[PDB]
Design a protein around this nucleic acid. Sequence first.
DNA 1: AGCAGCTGCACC
DNA 2: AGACGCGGACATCAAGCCCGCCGTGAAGGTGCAGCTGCT
Lengths: 217, 94, 325, 335
Amino acid sequence: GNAAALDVFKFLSLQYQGKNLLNWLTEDSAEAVQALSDNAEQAREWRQAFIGITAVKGAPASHSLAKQLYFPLPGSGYHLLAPLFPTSLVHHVHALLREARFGDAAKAAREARSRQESWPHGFSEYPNLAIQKFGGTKPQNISQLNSERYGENWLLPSLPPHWQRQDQRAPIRHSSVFEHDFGRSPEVSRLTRTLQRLLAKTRHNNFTIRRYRAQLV
Amino acid sequence: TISKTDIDCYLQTYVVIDPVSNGWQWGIDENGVGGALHHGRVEMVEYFGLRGATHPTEKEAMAAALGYLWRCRQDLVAIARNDAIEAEKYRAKA
Amino acid sequence: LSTASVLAFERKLDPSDALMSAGAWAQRDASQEWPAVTVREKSVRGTISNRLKTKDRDPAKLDASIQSPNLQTVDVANLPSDADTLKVRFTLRVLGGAGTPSACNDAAYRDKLLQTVATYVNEQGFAELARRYAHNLANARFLWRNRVGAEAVEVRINHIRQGEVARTWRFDALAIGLRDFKADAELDALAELIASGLSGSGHVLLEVVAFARIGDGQEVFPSQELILKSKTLYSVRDAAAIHSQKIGNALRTIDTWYPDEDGLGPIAVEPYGSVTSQGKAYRQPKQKLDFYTLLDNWVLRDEAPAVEQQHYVIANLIRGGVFGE
Amino acid sequence: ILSTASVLAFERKLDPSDALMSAGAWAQRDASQEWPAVTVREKSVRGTISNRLKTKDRDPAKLDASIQSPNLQTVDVANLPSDADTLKVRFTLRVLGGAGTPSACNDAAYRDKLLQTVATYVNEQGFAELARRYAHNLANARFLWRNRVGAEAVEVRINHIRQGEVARTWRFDALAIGLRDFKADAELDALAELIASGLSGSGHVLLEVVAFARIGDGQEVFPSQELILDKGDKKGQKSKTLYSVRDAAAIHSQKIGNALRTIDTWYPDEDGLGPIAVEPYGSVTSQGKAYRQPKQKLDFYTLLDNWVLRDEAPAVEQQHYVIANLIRGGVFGEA
DNA sequence: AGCAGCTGCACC
DNA sequence: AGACGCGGACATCAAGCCCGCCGTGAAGGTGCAGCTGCT
């Protein structure tokens, strides 16, 4: 909505024992005379004006700058397929990615690794994230959730394996190319070192580790 | 009030500790993932191998790696401090 | 009428990275195949020559001044042992169009600025600025620490007209001082050529070579790299070089008009004119004689400052940069 | 309150070159422009185990079997030829001037205070003492460091290069002049006056210094060694590396400069045991001791922050020492 | 003397 | 044409600098009240 109007939502989300029964305040009984302690008519009027405008549509539109892309049907025909941005889902994914790093469990389980220990559990890293900042200087124009997560799309990588691996060289110097400039290649080293890590282990659960040892070769 | 261990929480993932035939060699990881197979890339010193002394105990090699990170590569310490500030700002939020 | 939020000015007087070679005197004419001075990494063993800290002054840890060879590794550039002449070569392009910005948000301010600079060039042409640039070429101030003990310095400037020489100047850098702007016929011809390039009546690309006679085996000084070892000299294609910004700072030392006691010498042209190596900034904004106050009085309020201040303002426009709100 | 500058830098006067080494025969000293160069060559020696062994965590069986069997080492060496009894070292030296002007400062107040103090020093007493001591270290071949320990006859020849040829020659017997005494001679005083005119800013002084040392046929000459820092300290694959520029053995320039600065005959310990070099906290680290410790108030820094800040001058010998420290140059400055 | 467009403005 | 050897060894030491700084300008929508051109 309008950025000047967001104080109304800040009043609705005033967590007096929950903001779900106040923003969608359909089940209020004592709050009515608290909205207007002068009458009972304008109290019900303000209650309807607050809870009625939070479910309204108008008309379906996409104002010539949104996306709408054809989809080929099986026999013949098309559907227009105008997509939208799923801000609750992008909120929930960003909150999981914030909980896995800056949380209490990750802070506890990283201190154990700085000291080479055991502890109840482990942790994760989430590499190659990217930032896509929707609001330029003031994110209140787009969304309230775009203001709580200012800019900060927090996208996840779908890259090819060899993307940051540009190198151009010819082995004119060394005689044997398998021993030298093959292990010196950037990707082969983490295959070979993990193979040294895997070729000294237990053979009791062979059905998975032999498959991993075969796929790594 | 950010101690060296709070920065060391998020600085540790740029090192890798490989047990070798004599001991516990260490090396520096660029992507900050622990030197994994698919996502990471560990720099190799020029003989090719890890840039680390062959410490007997793993705490010694971990401390050598982390002290060399604090001493020489200050941009990685800057990334670790920028993470460590938000690590307690997130606790200040919830 | 107000000052634009974005104001950008492109650099005129663009030099190249000045490259260093070595050879013998009386072979200055056929000095084309001269071998390039190479930076060598060496390791030295010193002592502790720094003042002791509050933690290193303990009784059991006073051994740092006692037992510390201090074990450093640096870079060093020297001359070969049968060569006493160092040759520094660069190219200098002068463009023209001194007062036209490359970016602006208000075109009324742009028309006012163009009117002001055209008023300058109509009244006061590029006669003083080109003379000062030509005197900073004629003595080898481009040779910064390479000039401070040289027995004979000679600069030689060629005009690259099509691909070859059109005019040759052969100046003695030790007869022409480093703190006064005198007069000479060939210096005036070089000033006329530089003013013709700066006004826009031609294209000027000069080849400036400079010979400093240091002596055999001595230490020559290229530019030291800034690292964001502790001593890394600068080199392009395995040959020691000086940066182009240092050469451009050598030709920008034309400012003998500032609010301090200007009987000392010329300084470089900067807004809030600063010699950070001497720690003092002349042309402070408290006294109304820095570049922004004169530019906002000349363009906005039509309050023209003195002619020397106009020279300093046009020189700061030649240097270029980011001016605005 | 006129505190000192945070960034302070003084440049070097008396900048030498690397001393080139060549070989020849005595009484052919004067025609030494086509003399053959001394080369560094490798040799692989076989020694016995002659060192102190770490007997704390080693078994005596391996220790005994170690000190029975030999060890093999690769070591560089440089010797004279077998028809040559003379080493020649040659270098050049410029004496610049501009004694007390700093090339980097953060305060102009400290800069003008220091310039006034140094100008007061030069106006009250000239550059006569320091240049006399530098001429002493030139005329005796302390430049030839271990190549003059047991040499039979050492001769130093100093040339004043004006444009491209000689303008004044001195010839000195390096063993007639001592290594510890500072005497008075005629030609030594004329060379000291030339160095004094160089340090005064009243001329350009460029000198060519040659030294002929008569060692003997086929004996060992000693050029400088090299710090292999973090590149050969792993297992000891190469023992000794000697410094040579281009197929000719050489002495380091800072070694010649340390041979020129050995003029400090004033320090609060026993100064009668020998002159040392001018360093802040005057240090002979190879002798393992630090003369002019900062405990007693006689170092460079306490003297300079007493002189320039607090206007209390030390004795004439100590301000001679601090002017020698400014001639050597360096980085000073309080955080 | 009454409409539609435009511009400056208020707020978050 | 058929061959180009075995045996043993490859040191231990002390150190690794200081200081000052790190550019700014523009990158905003939504809706309302009043002015102005037009009729």
